[PDB]
Short mmCIF file of C-alpha atoms and ligand atoms in Angstrom, two decimals:
data_model
loop_
_atom_site.label_atom_id
_atom_site.label_comp_id
_atom_site.label_asym_id
_atom_site.label_seq_id
_atom_site.Cartn_x
_atom_site.Cartn_y
_atom_site.Cartn_z
CA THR P 1 26.28 -36.82 21.64
CA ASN P 2 23.48 -36.40 23.36
CA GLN P 3 22.04 -33.81 20.34
CA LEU P 4 22.31 -36.75 17.62
CA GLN P 5 20.49 -39.16 20.63
CA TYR P 6 17.63 -36.62 21.66
CA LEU P 7 17.49 -36.48 17.43
CA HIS P 8 17.11 -40.20 17.19
CA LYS P 9 15.52 -41.55 20.17
CA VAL P 10 12.61 -38.22 20.69
CA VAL P 11 12.47 -36.93 17.46
CA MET P 12 12.88 -38.98 15.32
CA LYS P 13 11.06 -41.81 16.87
CA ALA P 14 7.31 -39.34 16.92
CA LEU P 15 7.86 -38.65 13.63
CA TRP P 16 8.31 -42.32 12.38
CA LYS P 17 5.45 -43.64 14.18
CA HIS P 18 2.66 -41.08 12.68
CA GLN P 19 -0.19 -41.74 10.75
CA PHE P 20 1.06 -40.26 7.99
CA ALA P 21 4.98 -40.95 7.70
CA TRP P 22 4.23 -44.10 6.20
CA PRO P 23 5.11 -42.56 2.40
CA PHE P 24 8.37 -40.94 4.05
CA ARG P 25 10.11 -44.55 5.72
CA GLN P 26 11.91 -46.02 2.42
CA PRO P 27 13.21 -44.15 -0.16
CA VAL P 28 10.51 -42.70 -2.85
CA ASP P 29 10.27 -45.24 -5.93
CA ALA P 30 10.59 -43.02 -9.07
CA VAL P 31 9.48 -46.32 -11.30
CA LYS P 32 7.05 -48.30 -8.86
CA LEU P 33 4.46 -45.24 -8.01
CA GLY P 34 5.16 -43.69 -11.79
CA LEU P 35 7.24 -40.64 -11.35
CA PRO P 36 9.52 -41.12 -14.06
CA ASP P 37 10.53 -37.14 -14.00
CA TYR P 38 11.53 -37.84 -10.03
CA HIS P 39 15.28 -38.05 -10.22
CA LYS P 40 15.38 -35.19 -13.10
CA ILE P 41 13.80 -32.73 -10.57
CA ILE P 42 14.78 -34.06 -7.06
CA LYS P 43 18.25 -34.58 -7.14
CA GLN P 44 19.17 -35.20 -3.30
CA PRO P 45 16.57 -37.57 -2.89
CA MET P 46 16.21 -37.95 1.28
CA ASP P 47 14.30 -40.16 3.32
CA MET P 48 13.23 -41.06 7.08
CA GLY P 49 14.81 -44.55 6.73
CA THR P 50 18.47 -43.19 5.29
CA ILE P 51 18.18 -40.61 8.40
CA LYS P 52 17.32 -43.42 10.77
CA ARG P 53 20.61 -45.36 9.61
CA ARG P 54 23.09 -42.52 9.46
CA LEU P 55 22.16 -41.56 13.46
CA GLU P 56 22.28 -45.93 13.54
CA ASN P 57 26.11 -45.76 12.16
CA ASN P 58 26.87 -42.53 14.06
CA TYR P 59 27.51 -40.47 9.88
CA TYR P 60 26.11 -37.37 11.62
CA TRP P 61 29.31 -35.30 13.27
CA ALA P 62 26.78 -32.22 13.90
CA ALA P 63 23.08 -31.46 15.06
CA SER P 64 22.33 -29.40 11.92
CA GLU P 65 24.22 -31.91 9.57
CA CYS P 66 21.17 -34.07 10.57
CA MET P 67 18.65 -31.25 10.73
CA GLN P 68 19.10 -30.12 7.45
CA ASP P 69 18.39 -33.83 5.99
CA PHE P 70 15.20 -33.19 7.82
CA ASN P 71 14.68 -30.39 5.88
CA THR P 72 15.74 -31.60 2.86
CA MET P 73 13.16 -34.61 2.85
CA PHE P 74 10.22 -32.09 3.26
CA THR P 75 11.68 -29.31 0.74
CA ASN P 76 12.34 -32.10 -2.10
CA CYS P 77 8.47 -32.98 -1.47
CA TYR P 78 7.27 -29.48 -1.73
CA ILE P 79 9.52 -28.71 -4.61
CA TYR P 80 8.32 -32.30 -6.38
CA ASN P 81 4.75 -32.39 -5.78
CA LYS P 82 1.27 -30.12 -6.93
CA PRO P 83 0.48 -27.93 -4.24
CA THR P 84 -3.19 -29.88 -4.16
CA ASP P 85 -1.61 -33.36 -3.04
CA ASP P 86 -2.18 -34.84 -0.13
CA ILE P 87 1.23 -35.60 0.20
CA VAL P 88 2.56 -32.30 0.41
CA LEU P 89 -0.25 -32.20 3.52
CA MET P 90 1.64 -35.15 4.81
CA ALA P 91 4.97 -33.61 4.88
CA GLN P 92 3.77 -30.41 6.25
CA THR P 93 2.24 -32.22 8.85
CA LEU P 94 5.39 -34.18 9.78
CA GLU P 95 7.37 -30.99 9.56
CA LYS P 96 5.70 -29.35 12.20
CA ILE P 97 6.37 -31.49 14.69
CA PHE P 98 10.08 -31.84 13.63
CA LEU P 99 10.19 -28.38 14.34
CA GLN P 100 7.86 -28.51 17.54
CA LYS P 101 10.30 -31.00 19.08
CA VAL P 102 13.51 -29.72 17.52
CA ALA P 103 13.05 -26.48 20.39
CA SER P 104 13.17 -28.85 22.57
CA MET P 105 16.24 -30.00 21.89
CA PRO P 106 19.70 -30.24 24.51
CA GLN P 107 22.54 -27.06 24.95
CA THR F 1 11.99 -15.99 27.05
CA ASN F 2 15.29 -17.15 26.68
CA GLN F 3 14.62 -18.82 23.25
CA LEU F 4 12.61 -16.26 21.38
CA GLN F 5 15.70 -13.71 22.71
CA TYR F 6 17.74 -16.14 20.45
CA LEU F 7 15.75 -15.94 17.41
CA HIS F 8 15.70 -11.94 17.80
CA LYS F 9 19.12 -11.58 18.16
CA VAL F 10 20.74 -14.33 16.72
CA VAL F 11 18.69 -16.06 14.10
CA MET F 12 16.76 -12.99 12.82
CA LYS F 13 19.49 -10.56 12.87
CA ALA F 14 21.75 -13.34 10.37
CA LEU F 15 18.71 -13.57 8.37
CA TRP F 16 17.89 -10.25 7.87
CA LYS F 17 21.24 -8.76 6.53
CA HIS F 18 21.78 -11.68 4.09
CA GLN F 19 22.62 -10.59 0.36
CA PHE F 20 19.77 -13.46 -0.38
CA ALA F 21 17.10 -11.92 2.34
CA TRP F 22 15.53 -9.12 0.05
CA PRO F 23 12.99 -10.75 -1.20
CA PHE F 24 11.65 -11.94 1.66
CA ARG F 25 11.74 -8.68 3.81
CA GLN F 26 8.18 -7.82 2.68
CA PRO F 27 5.33 -9.80 1.74
CA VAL F 28 4.97 -11.26 -1.28
CA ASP F 29 3.37 -9.03 -4.09
CA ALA F 30 1.18 -10.78 -5.99
CA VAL F 31 0.62 -7.84 -8.09
CA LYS F 32 4.58 -6.43 -8.50
CA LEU F 33 5.34 -9.56 -9.43
CA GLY F 34 2.45 -10.47 -12.04
CA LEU F 35 1.39 -13.67 -10.36
CA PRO F 36 -2.37 -13.87 -10.27
CA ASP F 37 -2.55 -17.02 -8.19
CA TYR F 38 -0.13 -16.66 -5.84
CA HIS F 39 -3.15 -16.48 -3.25
CA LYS F 40 -4.76 -19.53 -4.41
CA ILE F 41 -2.30 -21.44 -4.39
CA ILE F 42 -0.32 -20.04 -0.62
CA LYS F 43 -3.17 -19.13 2.36
CA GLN F 44 -0.83 -18.33 4.89
CA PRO F 45 1.64 -15.55 3.43
CA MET F 46 4.43 -15.30 6.17
CA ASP F 47 7.72 -13.28 5.85
CA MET F 48 10.70 -11.87 7.75
CA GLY F 49 9.32 -8.55 7.72
CA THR F 50 6.24 -10.06 9.38
CA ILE F 51 8.74 -12.07 11.97
CA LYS F 52 11.03 -9.27 12.54
CA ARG F 53 7.90 -6.69 13.75
CA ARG F 54 6.34 -10.12 16.04
CA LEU F 55 9.85 -10.27 17.57
CA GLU F 56 9.73 -6.97 18.16
CA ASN F 57 6.26 -6.43 19.36
CA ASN F 58 6.30 -9.69 21.54
CA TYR F 59 3.67 -10.99 19.54
CA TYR F 60 5.24 -14.59 20.41
CA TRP F 61 4.29 -16.90 23.34
CA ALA F 62 6.81 -19.05 22.66
CA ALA F 63 9.44 -20.12 21.02
CA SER F 64 8.19 -22.45 18.75
CA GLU F 65 5.31 -20.33 17.86
CA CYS F 66 8.00 -18.45 15.91
CA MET F 67 10.01 -20.90 13.82
CA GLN F 68 6.56 -22.81 12.45
CA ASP F 69 6.57 -18.80 10.99
CA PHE F 70 10.11 -18.91 9.65
CA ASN F 71 9.13 -22.41 8.42
CA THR F 72 5.90 -21.55 6.36
CA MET F 73 7.98 -18.46 4.71
CA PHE F 74 9.95 -21.09 3.43
CA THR F 75 7.38 -23.99 2.52
CA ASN F 76 5.45 -21.74 1.12
CA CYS F 77 8.30 -20.45 -1.47
CA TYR F 78 8.91 -24.09 -2.07
CA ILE F 79 5.32 -25.09 -2.78
CA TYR F 80 4.39 -21.95 -4.88
CA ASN F 81 7.39 -21.69 -7.36
CA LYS F 82 8.88 -24.24 -10.13
CA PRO F 83 11.65 -26.72 -9.15
CA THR F 84 14.04 -24.46 -11.20
CA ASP F 85 12.95 -20.97 -9.85
CA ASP F 86 16.58 -19.22 -8.04
CA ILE F 87 14.21 -17.74 -5.49
CA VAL F 88 14.16 -21.30 -4.36
CA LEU F 89 17.09 -21.59 -4.02
CA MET F 90 17.89 -18.11 -2.14
CA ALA F 91 15.19 -19.81 0.19
CA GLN F 92 16.95 -23.31 0.39
CA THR F 93 20.07 -21.30 1.26
CA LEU F 94 18.57 -18.96 3.88
CA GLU F 95 16.90 -22.16 5.50
CA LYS F 96 19.88 -24.02 6.61
CA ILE F 97 21.32 -20.84 8.51
CA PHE F 98 17.98 -21.04 9.80
CA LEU F 99 18.32 -24.61 10.90
CA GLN F 100 22.11 -24.41 11.75
CA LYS F 101 20.96 -21.62 14.32
CA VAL F 102 18.08 -23.36 16.00
CA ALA F 103 20.33 -26.26 16.37
CA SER F 104 22.23 -23.79 19.22
CA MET F 105 19.44 -22.57 20.93
CA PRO F 106 19.03 -22.80 24.43
CA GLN F 107 15.95 -24.86 26.25
CA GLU F 108 13.48 -22.86 28.47
C1 LIG Y 1 8.43 -45.69 0.88
C2 LIG Y 1 7.53 -44.67 -0.10
S1 LIG Y 1 7.42 -45.50 -1.68
O1 LIG Y 1 7.86 -44.65 -2.52
O2 LIG Y 1 8.30 -47.10 -1.63
N1 LIG Y 1 5.73 -45.70 -1.24
C3 LIG Y 1 5.08 -44.35 -1.79
C4 LIG Y 1 3.63 -44.27 -1.15
C5 LIG Y 1 3.15 -43.92 -1.26
C6 LIG Y 1 3.70 -42.24 -1.66
O3 LIG Y 1 2.31 -41.24 -1.95
C7 LIG Y 1 1.22 -41.45 -1.66
C8 LIG Y 1 0.57 -40.43 -0.73
C9 LIG Y 1 -1.12 -41.09 -0.12
C10 LIG Y 1 -1.70 -40.78 -1.22
F1 LIG Y 1 -3.05 -41.02 -1.25
C11 LIG Y 1 -1.38 -41.73 -2.79
C12 LIG Y 1 0.75 -41.88 -2.79
F2 LIG Y 1 0.62 -42.44 -3.80
C13 LIG Y 1 4.95 -42.29 -1.92
C14 LIG Y 1 5.36 -40.46 -1.83
C15 LIG Y 1 6.31 -40.12 -1.61
N2 LIG Y 1 6.43 -38.97 -1.28
C16 LIG Y 1 8.04 -38.13 -0.68
C17 LIG Y 1 6.49 -38.31 -2.56
O4 LIG Y 1 6.90 -37.09 -2.40
C18 LIG Y 1 5.62 -38.42 -3.53
N3 LIG Y 1 4.39 -38.16 -4.29
C19 LIG Y 1 3.71 -38.88 -5.22
C20 LIG Y 1 4.00 -39.92 -4.28
C21 LIG Y 1 4.78 -39.81 -3.31
C22 LIG Y 1 5.74 -43.16 -2.01
C1 LIG Y 2 9.74 -8.28 -0.91
C2 LIG Y 2 8.64 -8.72 -1.09
S1 LIG Y 2 8.20 -8.13 -2.55
O1 LIG Y 2 7.50 -9.13 -3.29
O2 LIG Y 2 7.61 -7.03 -2.53
N1 LIG Y 2 9.50 -8.36 -4.25
C3 LIG Y 2 10.14 -9.47 -4.57
C4 LIG Y 2 10.84 -9.55 -5.67
C5 LIG Y 2 11.85 -10.48 -6.23
C6 LIG Y 2 11.31 -11.90 -5.95
O3 LIG Y 2 11.55 -13.09 -5.93
C7 LIG Y 2 12.93 -12.57 -6.85
C8 LIG Y 2 14.09 -12.91 -6.82
C9 LIG Y 2 15.06 -12.69 -7.64
C10 LIG Y 2 14.98 -12.20 -8.90
F1 LIG Y 2 16.53 -12.06 -9.98
C11 LIG Y 2 14.05 -12.07 -9.40
C12 LIG Y 2 12.43 -12.64 -8.55
F2 LIG Y 2 11.49 -12.26 -9.72
C13 LIG Y 2 9.90 -11.83 -5.34
C14 LIG Y 2 9.78 -13.48 -4.47
C15 LIG Y 2 9.70 -14.09 -3.03
N2 LIG Y 2 9.22 -14.83 -2.71
C16 LIG Y 2 9.24 -14.89 -1.33
C17 LIG Y 2 8.67 -15.57 -4.00
O4 LIG Y 2 7.99 -17.03 -3.35
C18 LIG Y 2 8.64 -15.32 -4.88
N3 LIG Y 2 7.86 -15.89 -6.22
C19 LIG Y 2 8.50 -15.23 -7.41
C20 LIG Y 2 9.05 -13.83 -6.68
C21 LIG Y 2 8.92 -14.36 -5.07
C22 LIG Y 2 9.25 -11.02 -4.26
#
């Protein structure tokens, strides 16, 4: 539907290109980053890559579904990371833009 | 606006009465909770009590403004607390509702 298309073509597109998007565009690599607790704390990993793919394979049945995955991705980052780490700020920024654009979503 | 009238009447009506709302209805009280570092970590405390009041006094110029306060209240909670605290789960459960509701907000 129109909403999933807006989330694809408008919202995801804007976040994807953002100067802070690079760490979010594929799943967290726990080994490559030296985060061996990661999968013990974050039991539902999400990333914009997985979300984009799902938006391409028509995985979602409603907008809120897709919205939830955005939220888990952010929530996850805020839960695992220290408050002082830049990655947290990076998510706050992206998260704010997601909300901004969701207000302008159709229906 | 249409959008803000949706947040007050649909969104906040549903969140304010939820069995998990209670820790969120008024500002985090660092003294009462024995959290001396709370204000050192969270710089923009937010709560539904504040948001409801703002909805009631038409403080917000646009819908998205309100949404960011709801966001900050949640983000605050996730950043301050331990991953395993119940308070997180409670925030998580309100936030799902918030987001589900926000998907059905009009557009003007
Ligand atoms: C495709 C992602 S990747 O995994 O393949 N690469 C990758 C690269 C850098 C990353 O973060 C950094 C950011 C800014 C710096 F200055 C240094 C960093 F290391 C993260 C990262 C992501 N996320 C969600 C976190 O929560 C998190 N916590 C700790 C690291 C991370 C992931
Ligand atoms: C109404 C504001 S209040 O401050 O006056 N009362 C109050 C009472 C209980 C609370 O949490 C609990 C919930 C359920 C339990 F079983 C035990 C708890 F402690 C919190 C609370 C809120 N928030 C946002 C937090 O981030 C947080 N972190 C640590 C506590 C909290 C605030």
